[PDB]
Ligand binder design. Structure first.
Ligand SMILES: CCCCCCCCCCCCCCCCCC(=O)OC[C@H](COP(=O)([O-])OCC(O)COP(=O)([O-])OC[C@@H](COC(=O)CCCCCCCCCCCCCCCCC)OC(=O)CCCCCCCCCCCCCCCCC)OC(=O)CCCCCCCCCCCCCCCCC
Ligand SMILES: CCCCCCCCCCCCCCCCCC(=O)O[C@@H](COC(=O)CCCCCCCCCCCCCCC)COP(=O)(O)OCC[N+](C)(C)C
Ligand SMILES: CCCCCCCCCCCCCCCCCC(=O)O[C@@H](COC(=O)CCCCCCCCCCCCCCC)COP(=O)(O)OC[C@H](O)CO
Ligand SMILES: CCCCCCCCCCCCCCCCCC(=O)O[C@@H](COC(=O)CCCCCCCCCCCCCCC)COP(=O)(O)OC[C@H](O)CO
Ligand SMILES: CCCCCCCCCCCCCCCCCCCC(=O)O[C@H](COC(=O)CCCCCCCCCCCCCC)COP(=O)(O)OCCN
Ligand SMILES: CCCCCCCCCCCCCCCCCC(=O)OC[C@H](COP(=O)(O)O)OC(=O)CCCCCCCCCCCCCCCCC
Ligand SMILES: CCCCCCCCCCCCCCCCCC(=O)OC[C@H](COP(=O)(O)O)OC(=O)CCCCCCCCCCCCCCCCC
Ligand code: HEM
Ligand code: HEM
Ligand SMILES: COC1=C(OC)C(=O)C(C/C=C(\C)CC/C=C(/C)CC/C=C(\C)CC/C=C(\C)CCC=C(C)C)=C(C)C1=O
Ligand SMILES: COC1=C(OC)C(=O)C(C/C=C(\C)CC/C=C(\C)CC/C=C(\C)CC/C=C(/C)CCC=C(C)C)=C(C)C1=O
Ligand SMILES: [Zn+2]
Lengths: 387, 28, 450, 116, 487
């Protein structure tokens, strides 16, 4: 057809990119509610950015004023309590949603070809999220903030020759002090924007081939437009998430946190129990399961190495756990193991938890070691199960 | 003669929305 | 309002027409430039006004190949006085419909509307034919839609074969295609169309026939718009010679087709034209692709023989294309790609059978009644009435009454049918086949059958 | 009118300056009319004969080459230039007239500009 | 010195085109005197005179209607019956079409060959057509053979034999016809549109019926059908052309004596088995067909509803067009303008179908696969626009075009006889042209807006599509495009 006149405004150059990427984008008709969590994570990112921009209007990144500025946000600025509870529990909601997202991807083998780049960009995004949330948790300048910053900046000392110089460069001095807090503030404003860009790249990589589906099959024969069907499905998800988040905000605003951070930072005394936020606990457990500095840091790096190498394993040509009984069972064991690692990270470092943590870390790495063997062996299934 | 009625309807809508966001009952 | 089953209140009902209305008489006025204006008053509230020109593809040779059909497509476009858009809007303002037809020896331009809009119709029709602007973009658009109109030609085997055997049956002007090749269209343009139209569209070659208007009003509107046209002396249409010929495009596949044709007298010679029409009715036939409605030719020789004695036949009937001084009578046929030889044998045998005298009086009376009812019924239509007036005044200048034709039909004996068919098939035949022609016999073998 | 060179000498200076600036590049004044500026120009250009549009395009390419090279036409070539010989204005006016006639009778436009 | 403006080839061409344009700049006023592009509502009740249509009711309820033109040499005489597939049952469905096949198969006096030989000996034609609500049998004959044609029709309606071997032969003809439902895709699309739109109503059944019904058809089935439906009060004998009312009435009184007189009446049949509209769609996806064909329809109006005239005007406003029409870019219809200007269809056609208790109003289009999205947008836009913005010029032009087409199509004895029979069945009377024109000119812009807001705005639609239709918008997108949220 010859486009002499103007048809739908949606197809005009003003709107065409948004239309083709957001309204008319072909989507497999059989996507479950487990495909709602990417849009949920997007909404969590926007919520964090909006609340953090408004909170930065009242927060003072100085060791003599930071704790007091938080308290002033809670007590003095109107609706300040809401803004703070929303940012602090929205970090937790962001991590819950992103975990559910990562586990949908693991269950349906969404990392497999041709979507390897999508998975790698997601891994980069997860690293960015971890760094952002950690340096954000330092900002209130409570006991938890100071001591967590101490250990995470100390992690660089695992490097033999230049480790100390990196630690002292990160601090801006010989100890965690005002320089650390001020640089952590700047980084905290910056990293969310890089997260937005990385998420956009993630989405573009995913639309190169379209979304995977719960059957794991080629879906070109039964695709439907995103708007309105998956718009309204994601809206159901958005309202349910709002109810969940509101329950956390209004009735249990401090259950996902530790009371130690309501004590101003004291560089003299480490609290008897020193743990990160809940969403970092599995990494904490893997770190502490190694009785060696360099070994622990190397295990932390090996976690992300395995996550990045997952899409490139020579595998069988079957994606969905719905048709892979062994991989499905290994999936539900990995989920249990991750929940156990999180629980172990919250425990003091003593018996029986050292052995349990070591075995759990081993199981976690066994998942990624065994999946390629499963693929190689299952390549022979169609030749061995004859009609 | 429908564009004028549409303008009046949308003007009523805009006024209703204004009184609803800002709620100036203590100022009127 | 009220439901349509109740009469509307307060409506001014015009008085009814009489159950017997005296027919009106054709008035033919000739202008000094040679243009003839004819009209008949009609009782119904519709007027049909046409302009008929004795131009056609028999004037394209040698340097205007494709001009006639392009002019057909370029009808009622932009004039020097009105844009195409304005002209379409004026036609639609009065609920009118336009049409143009192109033939080998005639072109026509017609407009139909209620009889109260006669001045507008006449004005728009003359502006259109006298003052074409022939804008290059409009010509180019009509030339793109000419390529489609010519490519879809292969989808009508009857039409394709008819043109093909016109090409293969004559040598002179009549052999010029009425659907020019694609190469012949990359030369046509607005200047060529203007030069062609100015040469051939003269007053003494044009008739303004208007069925359903008073002659006074038609003259009052049309005289001031056509007298300016200069006096151009009457030339002579070129001569065409009927010869033999074969047309063969082996496309392969399935669903062969054919048409065997012979020469018959033209419209001049007014006892044998009829013998050709009654012959065409006698052979008769049908498309054999659809059914429905008795009396359409299911019991003619062609139908009753082929479609009721030999199955696996897709089409079989007879055709006719008479010109002023010559004509083409022939028989179509589809058959099956390997049954083609048997099909041609059947057709030739049928021609020979009526040639010898194997047709009884019952069939002759049946075909005679079919001819008379076909001519009388086709005059029910106002369009056909106007077109017949125009064509007959172009050809004879008289509009001969239908009663003379009816007597010639009812003066036909078996001896006439026999001698005419004997004469027709004693002359060279025009063979045409289209589809899978490999199994189709040669020209010499088919010619030897007669 | 004041824009008449024969009646107003200021318009004479204006026309002389425009002609001299156009002649340095071998450009006609109608060559400055861009199809991308309005759909009426685009339609008028589409209605023109091919050889005229090819000559326009060749003059545009020559002018662009001169401008990129920081050069003007040679004086021998400048002497034969006809900067105000028109090929577009009459067709543009006809297209405008047809557009206005369509608008007056309530018809849809034959072409419209894309919303950016 | 610069060259003169004819030396260079391009300058010469520019001069030629400029001279042609200047030629167009000065029009000649002798040819600009009468025609106007502005539509005017005209009153011409003088030319609207027509011969009187005489309607006589027999004592048994039979109606005889004649339109006399004694200057004519021919005539059309026939029977129009208030009967069709809608008045059958589920197990009798298809019987009317079988009867249409079987009615020219011979009687007690006449055999198949006698009947064909009698007819084509006078040069006559015999026509049979059956639809959902109407059935007609008529003959086109010369003026002399009116009595013979009436005798032929009365004999075939009252004394048909229905031989078992003839029934079995026609059974296989019709079975092959059902097996060969292709090549006429317009008819297929409309059948599926009726089937989904009037789901679970008698109006949704096809004329042909199911194959098991035609396999089960016997003599007593056809005889029972004729007894049940071909009754005096449901039949109209219509004649046009060279016919005198009195002779036709006398012949009808003589010949049509052994009818059924069954008490079954069409109004009660429609009442107890009413037809309703169900918003729905059927999509026949076939990616080997080169062209897509679809129809979109709203629930329309019945024959007697006053809004039917406005729906006819609206159908004229939407119009119809195909690629071989010269001036589609310039017509008054905006939908046709959009389609022709952007080349987004092979054909487009608005239809207004009426029945006794409901109707269908919609658009049928043929287009290539890649044009479907824009075509659907344009169709929905221009249909929905009727509820919001209607110009006086457009409605005036449509009124003029509708009056012109109604009068112009009424040429020949056969169209006149068909008009008489159809009007007598649907209206109970032949509406005189002046009244029909008065009803048409009562449809102004506000009337069109009111009718569109009643039938089109925020209303359920029925869709039937076949071909490469994967890019045809889904039911929700067509349903959304029935209202405008900027108003
Ligand atoms: C919890 C995760 C939270 C995410 C919730 C979202 C759910 C979702 O995406 O859709 C699923 C679900 C169905 O949606 P769907 O897309 O139609 O279905 C897709 C499924 O594939 C439908 O598949 P299906 O028909 O097969 O149904 C299976 C379905 C649900 O059905 C079942 O699970 C059936 C199994 C029943 C039990 C079987 C018998 C047990 C055997 C005997 C005992 C042995 C084990 C003991 C277990 C007993 C149970 C505790 O399972 C799931 O979808 C997964 C749920 C559980 C995941 C793992 C949970 C781990 C958390 C920790 C709990 C346990 C860990 C150990 C701790 C020990 C202490 C207890 O959601 C709904 O009901 C509707 C969704 C509406 C919108 C919600 C989404 C937005 C959420 C907002 C964010 C808030 C956070
Ligand atoms: C710490 C915070 C972080 C988050 C923790 C939560 C982690 C949860 C991750 C969930 C994994 C996401 C992948 C989903 C894939 C699994 C799924 O959707 O359901 C399974 C089945 O899921 C399970 O087997 C769930 C196992 C866990 C059950 C125990 C958890 C408690 C829920 C039980 C219900 C409530 C009981 C409470 C007591 C009254 C079947 O899916 P398909 O193979 O696609 O088949 C669906 C289509 N069809 C069924 C029709 C064939
Ligand atoms: C980071 C957060 C995570 C995700 C959050 C989701 C955010 C986006 C929500 C998901 C997609 C919603 C997009 C909704 C747009 C729908 C557009 C629509 O329905 O268009 C209507 C109309 O709306 C528009 O056209 C508005 C767009 C204006 C262009 C700018 C109807 O269009 P039509 O084609 O039926 O006819 C109207 C025609 O387009 C106009 O000529
Ligand atoms: C985090 C890492 C964990 C490390 C674990 C340590 C090493 C163990 C690795 C093996 C994974 C443990 C879980 C494997 C068992 C899963 C449960 C299972 O598969 O049982 C199925 C039963 O069938 C089986 O699969 C048993 C097969 C036994 C293994 C035979 C091996 C030969 C096949 C080799 C193929 C290799 C590739 C296979 C790809 C799937 C389920 O049957 P059903 O769900 O279809 O229906 C029955 C139920 O009542 C209703 O739901
Ligand atoms: C923010 C919250 C405000 C709530 C109401 C805002 C407007 C809602 C209606 C507007 C709307 O969706 O209309 C669409 C806007 O289109 C366009 O973008 C072009 C149309 C021109 C704009 C006119 C829209 C109405 C003016 C409303 C402004 C006043 C708002 C005061 C609260 C076109 O939808 P459609 O269905 O008409 O198109 C179908 C044609 N195929
Ligand atoms: C005398 C005979 C010499 C023969 C040739 C010997 C080999 C020479 C070439 C060796 C290959 C290249 C050497 C690279 C030097 C690395 C820095 C080093 O060794 O420590 C110096 C020096 C520390 O020396 P320190 O004072 O002993 O700790 O490095 C730094 O100052 C810190 C920079 C290292 C970390 C940079 C960031 C890394 C991540 C970037 C993202
Ligand atoms: C429903 C959707 C399920 C997915 C997310 C799970 C969150 C709701 C389940 C309830 C447990 C959360 C809870 O109370 O945790 C506090 C849980 C028990 O309450 P507390 O001991 O009084 O603080 O202790 C923690 O602070 C653990 C850290 C949170 C880990 C759960 C992840 C969310
Ligand atoms: C550009 C966007 C952002 C800005 C301007 C911002 C700003 C701030 C500010 C000023 C604080 C200190 C006040 C307080 O403790 O409540 C803070 C704390 C925090 N931010 Fe952000 N933030 C942004 C995005 C994010 C994102 C994306 C995350 C999660 C990945 C996040 C996680 C946190 C966390 C965990 C805290 C500590 C909360 C607490 O216990 O009080 N922020 N942020
Ligand atoms: C800020 C964090 C993230 C955002 C905003 C985001 C956004 C999205 C969205 C909108 C989708 C498509 C809809 C859906 O499948 O839910 C998607 C899909 C996907 N994401 Fe992410 N994502 C994030 C983090 C991650 C992470 C951490 C991973 C893995 C390490 C990941 C891997 C994937 C994969 C594999 C898919 C394809 C799913 C499929 O086709 O089944 N994403 N993401
Ligand atoms: C008791 O102990 C512990 C804590 O305590 C309570 C913790 O919380 C955590 C939680 C930490 C986790 C899971 C990992 C944190 C990981 C990273 C990579 C953060 C390191 C990054 C920092 C400090 C800022 C990055 C600095 C940059 C980019 C410098 C900018 C320079 C330029 C632009 C040139 C763990 C493991 C722990 O065991
Ligand atoms: C068929 O496609 C679609 C999906 O299925 C694959 C989707 O999952 C989603 C949802 C996806 C998104 C957008 C979540 C990704 C997360 C991001 C990028 C969070 C950051 C959000 C911002 C700031 C938006 C960035 C974009 C622009 C242009 C900046 C300007 C906009 C704003 C200020 C809001 C949508 C809407 C969709 O239709
Ligand atoms: Zn049939």
């Amino acid at each position: 057809t010859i486009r002499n006149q103007r048809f739908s405004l949606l197809k005009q150059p003003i709107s065409s990119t948004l239309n083709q990427h957001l309204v008319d984008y072909p989507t497999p008709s059989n996507l479950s509610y487990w495909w709602g969590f990417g849009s949920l994570a997007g909404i969590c990112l926007v919520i964090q950015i909006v609340t953090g921009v408004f909170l930065a209007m009242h927060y003072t990144p100085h060791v003599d004023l930071a704790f007091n500025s938080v308290e002033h946000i809670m007590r003095d600025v109107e609706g300040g309590w809401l803004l703070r509870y929303m940012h602090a529990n929205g970090a937790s909601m962001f991590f819950i949603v992103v975990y559910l997202h990562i586990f949908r991807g693991l269950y349906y083998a969404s990392y497999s070809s041709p979507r390897e780049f999508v998975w790698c960009l997601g891994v980069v995004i997860f690293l960015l999220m971890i760094v952002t949330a950690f340096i954000g948790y330092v900002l209130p300048w409570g006991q938890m903030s100071f001591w967590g910053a101490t250990v995470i900046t100390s992690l660089a000392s695992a490097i033999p020759v230049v480790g100390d110089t990196i630690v002292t460069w990160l601090w801006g001095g010989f100890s965690v002090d005002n320089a650390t807090l001020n640089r952590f503030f700047s980084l905290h404003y910056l990293l969310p924007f890089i997260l937005v860009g990385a998420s956009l790249l993630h989405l573009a990589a995913l639309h190169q081939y379209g979304s995977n589906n719960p059957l794991g099959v080629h879906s070109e024969m039964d695709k439907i437009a995103f708007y309105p069907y998956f718009y309204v499905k994601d809206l159901v998800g958005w309202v349910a998430f709002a109810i969940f988040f509101s329950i956390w905000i209004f009735y249990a605003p401090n259950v996902l946190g530790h009371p130690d951070n309501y004590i101003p930072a004291n560089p003299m005394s480490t609290p008897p129990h020193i743990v990160p936020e809940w969403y970092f606990l599995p990494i904490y457990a893997i770190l502490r399961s190694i009785p060696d500095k360099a070994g622990g840091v190397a295990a932390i790096a090996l976690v992300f190495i395995c996550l990045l190498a997952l899409p490139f394993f020579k595998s069988m040509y079957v994606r969905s756990s719905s048709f892979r009984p062994i991989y499905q069972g290994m999936f539900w064991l990995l989920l249990a193991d991750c929940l156990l690692l999180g629980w172990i990270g919250c425990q003091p470092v003593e018996a029986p938890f050292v052995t349990i943590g070591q075995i759990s870390s081993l199981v976690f790495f066994l998942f990624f070691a065994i999946t390629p063997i499963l693929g190689r062996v299952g390549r022979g299934i169609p030749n061995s199960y004859t009609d | 003669t429908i564009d004028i009625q549409a303008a009046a309807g949308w003007g009523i809508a805009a006024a209703a929305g204004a009184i609803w966001v800002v709620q100036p009952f203590g100022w009127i | 309002l009220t439901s349509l089953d109740m009469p509307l209140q307060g409506v001014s009902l015009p008085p009814p027409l009489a159950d017997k209305v005296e027919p009106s008489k054709l008035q033919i006025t000739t202008l000094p430039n040679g243009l003839k204006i004819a009209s008949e008053t009609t009782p119904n509230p519709a007027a049909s006004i046409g302009l008929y020109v004795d131009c056609g593809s028999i004037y394209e040779a040698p340097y205007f190949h494709g001009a006639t059909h392009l002019l057909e497509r370029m009808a009622f476009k932009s004039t020097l006085n009105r844009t195409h858009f304005r002209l379409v809007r004026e036609i639609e303002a009065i609920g009118g419909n336009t049409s143009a037809s192109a033939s080998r020896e005639q072109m026509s331009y017609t407009i139909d509307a209620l009889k109260t809009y006669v001045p507008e119709m006449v004005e728009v029709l003359i502006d259109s034919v006298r003052n074409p602007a022939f804008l290059d973009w409009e010509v180019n658009e009509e030339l793109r839609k000419m390529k489609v109109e010519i490519a879809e030609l292969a989808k009508n085997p009857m039409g394709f074969l008819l043109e093909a055997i016109h090409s293969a049956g004559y040598s002179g002007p009549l052999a010029s295609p009425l659907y020019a090749p694609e190469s012949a269209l990359d030369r046509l343009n607005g200047e060529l169309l203007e030069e062609f139209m100015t040469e051939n569209f003269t007053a003494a070659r044009m008739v303004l026939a208007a069925s359903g208007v008073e002659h006074e009003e038609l003259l009052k509107v049309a005289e001031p718009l056509t007298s300016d046209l200069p006096n151009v002396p009457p030339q002579l249409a070129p001569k065409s010679q009927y010869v033999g010929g074969d047309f063969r495009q082996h496309t392969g596949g399935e669903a062969t087709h054919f048409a065997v044709a012979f020469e018959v007298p033209g419209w001049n010679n007014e006892k044998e034209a009829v013998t050709a029409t009654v012959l065409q009715m006698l052979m008769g036939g049908g498309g054999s692709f659809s059914a429905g409605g008795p009396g359409k030719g299911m019991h003619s020789w062609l139908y009753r023989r082929v479609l009721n004695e030999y199955q696996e036949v897709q089409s079989c009937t007879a055709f006719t294309s008479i010109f002023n001084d010559t004509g083409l009578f022939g028989i179509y046929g589809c058959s099956s790609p390997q049954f083609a030889a048997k099909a041609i044998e059947l057709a030739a045998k049928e021609l020979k059978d009526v040639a010898g005298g194997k047709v009884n009086q019952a069939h002759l009376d049946r075909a005679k009644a079919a001819t008379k009812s076909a001519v009388l019924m086709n005059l029910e239509s106002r369009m056909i009435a106007a077109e017949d007036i125009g064509r007959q005044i172009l050809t004879y200048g008289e509009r001969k009454p239908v009663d003379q034709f009816l007597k010639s039909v009812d003066q036909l004996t078996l001896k006439d049918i026999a001698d005419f068919t004997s004469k027709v098939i004693s002359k060279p035949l025009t063979m045409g086949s289209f589809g899978d022609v490999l199994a189709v016999p040669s020209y010499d073998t088919i010619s030897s059958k007669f | 009118r004041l824009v008449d060179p024969r009646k107003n000498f200021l318009a004479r200076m204006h026309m002389k300056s425009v002609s001299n600036r156009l002649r340095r590049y071998g450009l006609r004044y109608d060559d400055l009319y861009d199809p991308l500026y309005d759909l009426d120009i685009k339609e008028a250009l589409n209605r023109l004969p091919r050889e005229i549009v090819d000559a326009r395009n060749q003059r545009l390419m020559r002018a662009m080459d001169l401008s990129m090279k920081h050069e003007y036409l040679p004086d021998n070539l400048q002497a034969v230039q006809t900067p105000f010989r028109s090929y577009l204005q009459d067709m543009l006016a006809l297209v405008k007239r047809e557009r206005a006639e369509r608008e007056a009778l309530g018809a849809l436009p034959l072409y419209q500009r894309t919303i950016p | 010195s610069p060259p003169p403006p004819h030396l260079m080839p391009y300058d010469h061409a520019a001069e030629i085109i400029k001279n042609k344009i200047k030629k167009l700049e000065n029009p000649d006023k002798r040819f600009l005197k009468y025609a106007s592009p502005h539509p005017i509502l005209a009153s011409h009740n003088h030319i609207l005179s027509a011969p009187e249509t005489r309607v006589t009711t027999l004592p048994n309820g039979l109606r005889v209607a004649t339109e006399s033109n004694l200057s004519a040499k021919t005539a059309t005489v026939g029977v129009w019956i208030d009967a069709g597939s809608r008045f059958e049952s589920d197990e009798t469905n298809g019987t009317a079409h079988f009867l249409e096949h079987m009615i020219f198969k011979g009687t007690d006096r006449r055999t198949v060959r006698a009947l064909e030989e009698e007819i084509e000996d006078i040069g006559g034609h015999l026509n049979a057509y059956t639809s959902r609500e109407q059935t007609t049998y008529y003959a086109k004959v010369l003026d002399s053979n009116v009595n013979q044609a009436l005798d032929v029709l009365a004999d075939i309606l009252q004394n048909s034999k229905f031989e078992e071997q003839r029934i079995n032969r026609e059974r296989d003809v019709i079975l092959r016809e059902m097996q060969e439902v292709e090549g006429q895709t317009d008819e297929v699309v409309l059948d599926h549109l009726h089937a989904t739109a009037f789901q679970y109503t008698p109006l949704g059944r096809t004329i042909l019926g199911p194959a098991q019904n035609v396999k089960s058809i016997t003599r007593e089935d056809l005889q029972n059908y004729i007894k049940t439906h071909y009754t005096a009060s449901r039949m109209v004998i219509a004649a046009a052309g060279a016919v005198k009312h009195e002779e036709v009435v006398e012949q009808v009184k003589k010949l049509f004596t052994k009818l059924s007189s069954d008490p079954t009446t069409t109004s009660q049949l429609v009442a107890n088995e009413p037809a309703s509209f169900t918003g729905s769609e059927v999509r026949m996806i076939d990616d080997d067909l080169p062209l897509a064909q679809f129809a979109v329809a709203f629930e329309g109006a019945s024959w007697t509803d006053p809004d039917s005239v406005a729906l006819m005007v609206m159908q004229t406003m939407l119009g119809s067009w195909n690629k071989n029409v010269g001036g589609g870019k310039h017509v008054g219809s905006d939908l046709t303008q959009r389609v022709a200007i952007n080349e987004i269809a092979e054909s487009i056609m608005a239809f207004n179908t009426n029945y006794k208790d409901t109707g269908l109003f919609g658009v049928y289009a043929v287009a290539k696969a890649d044009c479907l999205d824009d075509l659907s947008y344009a169709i929905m836009y221009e249909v929905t626009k009727l509820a919001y913005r209607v110009s006086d010029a457009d409605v005036t032009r449509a009124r003029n075009q509708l009056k012109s087409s109604l009068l112009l199509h009424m040429d020949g004895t056969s169209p006149i006889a068909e008009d008489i029979g159809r009007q007598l069945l649907t209206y109970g009377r032949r509406i005189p042209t002046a009244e029909l024109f008065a009803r048409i000119d009562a449809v102004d812009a506000s009337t069109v807006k009111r009718v569109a807001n009643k039938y089109i705005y925020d209303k359920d639609i029925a869709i039937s599509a076949i071909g490469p239709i994967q890019d045809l918008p889904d039911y929700n997108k067509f349903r959304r495009r029935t209202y405008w949220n900027r108003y």
